[PDB]
Amino acid sequence: LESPGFMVHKKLKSMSQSYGVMMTGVPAEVLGQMQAERSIPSINKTGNLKQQIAKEVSKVCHMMTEPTQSCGQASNDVCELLLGKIEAEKFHFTKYEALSADGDNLKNVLENTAPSSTNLLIRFEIDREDPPIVLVKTKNENFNPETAVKNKIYLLENKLYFIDKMGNLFNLGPGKKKCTQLFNAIGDSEYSLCDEPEKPEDFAISEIVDIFNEQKERFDFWIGSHSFTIYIPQTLGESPRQFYPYQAYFGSHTLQDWFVSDKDEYLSRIGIDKYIEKLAVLGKTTNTKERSDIYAEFFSKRGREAFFCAHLNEKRQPLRVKFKITEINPELALKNLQETQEFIDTHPGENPSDKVENYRNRAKLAMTEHLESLLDI
User: Where does the MvcA insertion domain start and stop, copy by copy (predicted)?
Assistant: First the structure.
């Protein structure tokens, strides 16, 4: 006997293992048309249209068969199944809460809920602190704020700008005489913002770093790094409470790969408390080795834990762990899972893999035709 809440997990996992991308419930023709519209800006109207259409369809079709599911898309898919559209939107505008340094605030919410009578969905976001590291000196001409590389400081003859991660332009304060003074004290080669100054150039770069650091408050250097959810279904009786983490990782594995690999069950055995503690260590530590190892253990494709964050992929920047939590109505979630299953059942195909191939073919056809129509082929 399994609680309805657990059946939500069992059906979600099984369906994802079998049907992969069809999980979204988006009709193949809609998906293909969205891919076509996404490709349109890449197609130069002056050029060979038939050729570029064939190239864009091939790119997208390659990606269908590669791990190109973002972690946020997987989380949004889990939230919509379990919550339904209206409540998942509400959940999206709920504010994230920062995990306390030991994860007490999260554990407390779990201890304040009865394992028998509640079904919990937690959504996590991991941010990394990514301040600028390079100063670019440039003339006013050839400096265009719309096209310039984000997350850098730019020194002009008359201005000192910081473009942040969003491409927002921040004037850092100095007047024209201060900037023209700084412009001339530096040489001809981008320059580092991270390194006892001796050359007159070293003192001007050091000035710009001080100017920048004074107003750190104006800026947000944190950037989303990873996203995942955890589902904690209601238990039966005195059965111990169990969690399951769900995720995709763009470029490494999809949510289907996750579930096929059973890493959700593998991490589940760690226990929700020991899992929260390690998340808290991940956000609190200053140790790169410890940061990389926890990150790889929790978030890598199964079997790559030893090198996912090794060498160049070391997590050398401070991380931050945020969460939001809601309750789940299992019968609503089961209704949504069943509606998605009926959507899947309508695709021709004897095996799940046949239906996925049917879906992909239909998306490709729909993209080709929409791209031809839009470009008038």
Answer: 132-220
